[PDB]
Design an enzyme around this catalytic site. Structure first.
Site, PDB file in Angstrom:
ATOM      1  CG  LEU A 148      -1.982  -1.048   1.169  1.00  0.00           C
ATOM      2  CD1 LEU A 148      -2.291  -1.549   2.560  1.00  0.00           C
ATOM      3  CD2 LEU A 148      -3.222  -0.554   0.497  1.00  0.00           C
ATOM      4  N   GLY A 149       1.957   1.213   0.719  1.00  0.00           N
ATOM      5  CA  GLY A 149       2.910   2.303   0.811  1.00  0.00           C
ATOM      6  C   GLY A 149       3.998   1.988   1.802  1.00  0.00           C
ATOM      7  CB  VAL A 150       7.435   2.844   2.412  1.00  0.00           C
ATOM      8  CG1 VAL A 150       8.472   2.949   3.528  1.00  0.00           C
ATOM      9  CG2 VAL A 150       7.660   1.591   1.595  1.00  0.00           C
ATOM     10  N   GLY A 151       5.587   3.658   5.218  1.00  0.00           N
ATOM     11  CA  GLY A 151       5.343   4.588   6.307  1.00  0.00           C
ATOM     12  C   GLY A 151       6.603   5.057   6.995  1.00  0.00           C
ATOM     13  CB  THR A 152       6.900   6.888  10.261  1.00  0.00           C
ATOM     14  OG1 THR A 152       5.996   7.906   9.825  1.00  0.00           O
ATOM     15  CG2 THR A 152       7.969   7.509  11.147  1.00  0.00           C
ATOM     16  CG  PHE A 153       9.154   3.998  12.829  1.00  0.00           C
ATOM     17  CD1 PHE A 153      10.300   4.792  12.755  1.00  0.00           C
ATOM     18  CD2 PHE A 153       8.210   4.297  13.816  1.00  0.00           C
ATOM     19  CE1 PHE A 153      10.454   5.913  13.593  1.00  0.00           C
ATOM     20  CE2 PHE A 153       8.391   5.389  14.680  1.00  0.00           C
ATOM     21  CZ  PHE A 153       9.506   6.195  14.557  1.00  0.00           C
ATOM     22  N   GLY A 154       8.282   1.527   8.416  1.00  0.00           N
ATOM     23  CA  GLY A 154       8.094   0.257   7.711  1.00  0.00           C
ATOM     24  C   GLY A 154       7.080   0.185   6.593  1.00  0.00           C
TER      25      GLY A 154
ATOM     26  CG  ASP B 236       4.185  13.030   9.191  1.00  0.00           C
ATOM     27  OD1 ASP B 236       4.492  13.659   8.143  1.00  0.00           O
ATOM     28  OD2 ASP B 236       4.063  11.771   9.241  1.00  0.00           O
TER      29      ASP B 236
HETATM   30  O1  LIG Z   1      10.639  -5.505   3.116  1.00  0.00           O
HETATM   31  C1  LIG Z   1      11.170  -5.563   4.241  1.00  0.00           C
HETATM   32  O2  LIG Z   1      12.134  -4.664   4.664  1.00  0.00           O
HETATM   33  C2  LIG Z   1      12.555  -3.668   3.729  1.00  0.00           C
HETATM   34  O3  LIG Z   1      13.943  -3.826   3.498  1.00  0.00           O
HETATM   35  C3  LIG Z   1      14.431  -2.945   2.472  1.00  0.00           C
HETATM   36  C4  LIG Z   1      15.861  -3.446   2.374  1.00  0.00           C
HETATM   37  O4  LIG Z   1      16.886  -2.881   2.681  1.00  0.00           O
HETATM   38  O5  LIG Z   1      15.895  -4.727   1.892  1.00  0.00           O
HETATM   39  C5  LIG Z   1      14.231  -1.488   2.896  1.00  0.00           C
HETATM   40  O6  LIG Z   1      14.666  -0.603   1.865  1.00  0.00           O
HETATM   41  C6  LIG Z   1      12.752  -1.244   3.235  1.00  0.00           C
HETATM   42  O7  LIG Z   1      12.481   0.096   3.654  1.00  0.00           O
HETATM   43  C7  LIG Z   1      12.256  -2.265   4.262  1.00  0.00           C
HETATM   44  O8  LIG Z   1      10.867  -2.076   4.554  1.00  0.00           O
HETATM   45  C8  LIG Z   1      10.873  -6.479   5.282  1.00  0.00           C
HETATM   46  C9  LIG Z   1      11.362  -6.520   6.578  1.00  0.00           C
HETATM   47  N1  LIG Z   1      10.739  -7.544   7.251  1.00  0.00           N
HETATM   48  C10 LIG Z   1       9.858  -8.163   6.378  1.00  0.00           C
HETATM   49  C11 LIG Z   1       9.021  -9.238   6.588  1.00  0.00           C
HETATM   50  C12 LIG Z   1       8.269  -9.602   5.500  1.00  0.00           C
HETATM   51 CL1  LIG Z   1       7.263 -10.902   5.802  1.00  0.00          CL
HETATM   52  C13 LIG Z   1       8.280  -8.975   4.206  1.00  0.00           C
HETATM   53  C14 LIG Z   1       7.374  -9.373   3.067  1.00  0.00           C
HETATM   54  C15 LIG Z   1       5.963  -9.514   3.215  1.00  0.00           C
HETATM   55  C16 LIG Z   1       5.169  -9.852   2.111  1.00  0.00           C
HETATM   56  C17 LIG Z   1       5.747 -10.044   0.817  1.00  0.00           C
HETATM   57  C18 LIG Z   1       4.863 -10.357  -0.402  1.00  0.00           C
HETATM   58  O9  LIG Z   1       4.543  -9.195  -1.169  1.00  0.00           O
HETATM   59  C19 LIG Z   1       3.598 -11.188  -0.077  1.00  0.00           C
HETATM   60  C20 LIG Z   1       3.945 -12.155  -1.206  1.00  0.00           C
HETATM   61  C21 LIG Z   1       5.344 -11.540  -1.280  1.00  0.00           C
HETATM   62  C22 LIG Z   1       7.145  -9.908   0.691  1.00  0.00           C
HETATM   63  C23 LIG Z   1       7.951  -9.582   1.788  1.00  0.00           C
HETATM   64  C24 LIG Z   1       9.147  -7.905   4.028  1.00  0.00           C
HETATM   65  C25 LIG Z   1       9.929  -7.502   5.123  1.00  0.00           C
HETATM   66 CL   LIG Z   2       4.138   6.165   0.484  1.00  0.00          CL
END
Ligand SMILES: O=C(O[C@@H]1O[C@H](C(=O)O)[C@@H](O)[C@H](O)[C@H]1O)c1c[nH]c2cc(Cl)c(-c3ccc(C4(O)CCC4)cc3)cc12
Ligand SMILES: [Cl-]
Ligand SMILES: Nc1ncnc2c1ncn2[C@@H]1O[C@H](COP(=O)(O)OP(=O)(O)O)[C@@H](O)[C@H]1O
Ligand SMILES: Nc1ncnc2c1ncn2[C@@H]1O[C@H](COP(=O)(O)O)[C@@H](O)[C@H]1O
Ligand SMILES: Nc1ncnc2c1ncn2[C@@H]1O[C@H](COP(=O)(O)O)[C@@H](O)[C@H]1O
Ligand SMILES: [Cl-]
Ligand SMILES: [Cl-]
Ligand SMILES: [Cl-]
Ligand SMILES: [Cl-]
Lengths: 281, 362, 159
Positions: free
Chosen positions: B14-20, B131
């Site tokens: 949906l988007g990227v928020g403040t902490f995730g 914010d």
């Molecule tokens: O994306 C993540 O961290 C990001 O890391 C970036 C970086 O450096 O790699 C930063 O730039 C960024 O800001 C940061 O948020 C995640 C941290 N913990 C997670 C746990 C899960 Cl389960 C998932 C997750 C959920 C559903 C799908 C699907 O879309 C559902 C089917 C695949 C895929 C992946 C993602 C993360």
């Molecule tokens: Cl956003």
């Protein structure tokens, strides 16, 4: 009793207001400044804090001003050197010697009935509310406030027989303030009705009207008549009137006690806020 | 091969928020949709926001307002933390305003009332969402406002100001861009006024590509009022967009304003401080430290202007705390403020303070 | 439930683990992250990745080398990992500021009851205010809150 059960349930806190003012005096404070501070702050009583004791030792009220004034007035030609230069404790030492009287107080969570009972129990008009975790004095619970509360929730005087009607302490028009103060000391009653050439009541000099002496800095002259004194500014009730309607009269005019009088406006007795809350306990 | 948390299949981001990242969740059976904030434990510990989140969850888990996004449940995993929240189809209010133009007096008033109610709820709960912007106001299928990113939010504690300079510079209060100290709700009001302008005009009141002049404008509180703008709301905006927080509209003054009140639904709603000395700040702090020890009081030096001092009671044998802070009043004078620290408390506080004053500068 | 994320590119990526009897489970890719979430019992579990024809482990995650030189990642799924606040607690291991105008907005200076006062802004509670020392007597004051009510206590103290 229906009233008594309602008071037994309600917490003192419910009566503490939204935002209040509290004036506390350090016992080492010069007692003259102490009364002057009551007047300036617009308060009738203040708790006292002994720094050496690290606790609230008592309450400083107008009775203390009455007491000093009488115990120590010499004349209008001399200063009440005592009052002028004496600390609260220096005088508390004198006022209460071999006769000792501790600090009476209530908790905000404690019952309203428990509080009303405590006032008559120790024979007082001002009750400080202290929270036990903080030890901080929060509010000073008065009869006038509790009654306005009971009357807010309320949704003959001759039959029930309520108040003091025998050997009633009163003064004449001519009576000097000193004499009157001496009465407040020996009798120990809140107000003294002013009577004319005839037994009829013309006015009333209250423990309150004694602050105007502090306020206007006129305590140095107590030879002045009670009427002369009351010039800086009457309410009566009859035995053939209902208690509900008589309680209603006291709160609508916010008076501390009503005068029981006959047709010819001649004194018959008095019904205090004290007696009322007691009869309802 | 569907990625699930709760019984919701994690879909699109949906988007990227403040902490995730914030992803959609469609329930396995019911098909119900949720908004899922993903907080990686290792990252929320990198930025030292671990405490922030602890608080944020605590608050949002007990909040329940119709114009604030509901926090259904927080799921913890060894890896990350999942915040299951209510989903709204409408998306950003921002895009609404981009797509469609500005909103009509009637439509804007509704959404402003809706937003403000929530803003109020927050404050009425010692929470101040800094914010606050159209980008953080979401819409549902029935066009109802929903306040969303409490990542920049903070708590309001009796006797303290906030410092953090949070949020988009267009919505940032002059004192926030100025990086001065603030109570909290005033900075939410300044943002809401900007939101109100955006609803009525479809543009920003303070906006420039040249960042220094964007800031000049904000601190000059000067914005253009188009000819279509209703003088009554212009009046409201004039009051809400005061540079002086002391002169700015309160949630009560807004409630009382006639533009607001219109068609508003039922469902929503000679003293001196401290001691002032003209000496050099370093001298003042040295003087306080040389006097505090001169009283045998235990202390901890936080900032070179914040001091947390404790005193042992010689009678009741109880510890009593107080916080000392220096502020700059004039361009020529400074003042030492005394704050009581909660565990007679009040009287012991006064005594503690008094002692210092008798041996100190004005 | 535990998260399994492979950070780095790939066409096809699988998770083999003690939990799934080392069967190749396919992780779904969003972008540069390949993930699967599955609940595992509160115990020790070893796992490896089958990333595009090769068998690896996350170098960043704890490993275990076997008596046979088998290197697999390990995961100790702790009781604390389940509960949010339990986990968040376990995860936690100049110039003088200008005077805020708020601290000058008092409730004493600005018919009616002299004891009764206005409600204060939270920001000015517990702050010490005083009156000029006139007649060798200091007058200190402060507003404090007890429950949903407030008390502005003022001490008349000689010096
Ligand atoms: O994306 C993540 O961290 C990001 O890391 C970036 C970086 O450096 O790699 C930063 O730039 C960024 O800001 C940061 O948020 C995640 C941290 N913990 C997670 C746990 C899960 Cl389960 C998932 C997750 C959920 C559903 C799908 C699907 O879309 C559902 C089917 C695949 C895929 C992946 C993602 C993360
Ligand atoms: Cl956003
Ligand atoms: N709570 C209290 N504890 C101890 N002494 C008190 C208390 N309240 C009043 N006193 C004392 O009782 C005496 C009479 O006071 P009081 O009748 O209450 O005053 P007033 O009628 O002017 O309000 C005074 O000597 C006063 O110091
Ligand atoms: N002038 C008075 N003479 C005699 N008793 C009185 C008088 N005024 C009050 N009382 C009584 O004094 C007691 C305490 O009341 P009060 O000090 O008036 O609040 C009660 O029993 C009153 O009825
Ligand atoms: N029965 C009464 N009639 C008229 N004035 C009264 C009466 N009782 C008290 N007062 C006045 O009420 C004021 C406050 O006194 P007190 O009731 O003791 O607080 C004084 O000015 C008294 O003269
Ligand atoms: Cl869908
Ligand atoms: Cl929706
Ligand atoms: Cl916009
Ligand atoms: Cl990796």
């Amino acid at each position: 009793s229906v009233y008594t059960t309602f008071m037994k349930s309600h917490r003192c806190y419910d009566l503490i207001p939204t935002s209040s003012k509290l004036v506390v005096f350090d016992t080492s404070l010069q007692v003259k400044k102490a009364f002057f501070a009551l007047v300036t702050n617009g308060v009738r009583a203040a708790p006292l804090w002994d720094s050496k004791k690290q606790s609230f030792v008592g309450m400083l009220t107008i009775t203390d001003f009455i007491n000093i004034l009488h115990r120590y007035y010499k004349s209008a030609l001399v200063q009440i050197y005592e009052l002028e230069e004496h600390k609260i404790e220096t005088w508390r030492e004198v006022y209460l010697q071999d006769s000792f009287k501790p600090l009476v107080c209530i908790s905000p969570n404690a019952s309203l009935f428990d509080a009303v009972s405590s006032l008559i129990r120790n024979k007082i008009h001002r009750l400080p509310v202290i929270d036990p975790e903080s030890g901080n004095t929060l509010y000073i619970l008065t009869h006038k406030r509790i009654l306005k509360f009971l009357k807010l929730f309320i949704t003959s005087l001759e039959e029930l027989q309520i108040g003091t009607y025998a050997n009633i302490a009163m003064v004449r028009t001519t009576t000097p303030v000193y004499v009157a103060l001496g009465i407040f000391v020996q009798h120990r009653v809140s107000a003294l009705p002013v009577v004319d050439e005839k037994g009829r009541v013309v006015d009333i000099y209250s423990k309150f009207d004694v602050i105007n002496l502090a306020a206007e800095k006129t305590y140095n002259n107590l030879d002045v008549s009670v009427t002369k004194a009351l010039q800086h500014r009457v309410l009566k009730c009859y035995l053939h009137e209902t208690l509900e309607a008589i309680i209603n009269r006291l709160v609508e005019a916010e008076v501390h006690r009503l005068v029981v009088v006959d047709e010819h406006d001649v004194v018959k007795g008095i019904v205090s806020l004290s007696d009322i809350l007691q009869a309802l306990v | 091969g569907r990625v699930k948390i709760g019984h919701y299949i994690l879909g699109d981001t949906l988007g990227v928020g403040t902490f995730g990242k914030v992803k959609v969740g469609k329930h396995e059976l019911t098909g119900h949709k949720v908004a899922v904030k993903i907080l990686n434990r290792q990252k929320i510990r990198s930025l030292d926001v671990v405490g922030k989140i602890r608080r944020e969850i605590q608050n949002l888990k007990l909040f329940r307002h119709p114009h604030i996004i509901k926090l259904y449940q927080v799921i913890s995993t060894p890896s990350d933390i999942f915040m299951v929240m209510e989903y709204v189809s409408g998306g950003e209010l921002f895009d609404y305003i981009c797509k469609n133009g500005r909103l009509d007096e009637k439509e804007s008033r509704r959404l402003f009332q809706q937003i403000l109610s929530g803003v109020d709820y927050c404050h009425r709960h010692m929470v101040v969402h800094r914010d606050l912007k159209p980008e953080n106001v979401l819409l549902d299928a029935h066009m109802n406002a929903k306040i969303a990113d409490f990542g920049l939010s903070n708590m309001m504690s009796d006797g303290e100001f906030l410092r953090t300079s949070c949020g988009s510079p267009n919505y940032a209060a002059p004192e926030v861009i100025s990086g001065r100290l603030y109570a909290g709700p005033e900075v939410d009001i300044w943002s809401s006024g900007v939101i109100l302008y955006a609803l009525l005009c479809g543009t920003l009141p303070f906006d420039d590509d040249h960042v220094p002049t964007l800031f000049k404008k904000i601190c000059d509180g000067i914005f253009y009022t188009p000819q279509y703008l209703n003088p009554s709301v212009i009046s409201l905006l004039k009051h809400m967009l005061q540079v002086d927080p002391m002169k700015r509209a309160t949630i009560k003054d807004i409630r009382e304003h006639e533009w607001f009140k219109q068609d508003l639904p039922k469902y929503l709603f000679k003293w001196h401080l401290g001691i002032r000395s003209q000496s050099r700040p370093n001298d003042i702090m040295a003087e306080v430290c040389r006097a505090i020890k001169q009283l045998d009081y235990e202390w901890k030096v936080v900032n070179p202007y914040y001091l947390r001092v404790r005193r042992k009671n010689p009678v009741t044998s109880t510890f009593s705390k107080m916080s000392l802070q220096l502020y700059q009043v004039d361009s020529r004078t400074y003042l030492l403020d005394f704050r009581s620290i909660d565990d007679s408390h009040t009287i012991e506080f006064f005594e503690m303070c008094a002692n210092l004053i008798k041996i100190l500068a004005q | 439930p535990t998260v399994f994320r492979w950070t780095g590119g790939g066409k096809e990526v699988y998770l083999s683990g003690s939990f799934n009897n080392w069967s190749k489970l396919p992780l779904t890719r969003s972008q540069n992250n390949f993930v699967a979430i599955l609940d595992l019992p509160e115990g020790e579990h070893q796992y490896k990745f089958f990333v595009d024809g090769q068998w690896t482990h996350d170098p960043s995650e704890p490993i275990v080398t076997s008596q046979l030189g088998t290197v697999n990642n390990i995961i100790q799924v702790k009781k604390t990992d389940f509960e949010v606040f339990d986990a968040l607690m376990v995860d936690s291991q100049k110039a003088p500021p200008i005077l805020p105008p708020h601290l000058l907005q008092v409730i004493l200076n600005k018919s009616c009851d002299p004891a009764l006062l206005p409600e204060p802004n939270h920001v000015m509670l517990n702050h010490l205010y005083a009156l000029s020392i006139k007649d060798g007597v200091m007058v200190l004051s402060a507003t404090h809150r007890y429950k949903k009510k407030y008390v502005t206590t003022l001490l008349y103290k000689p010096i």
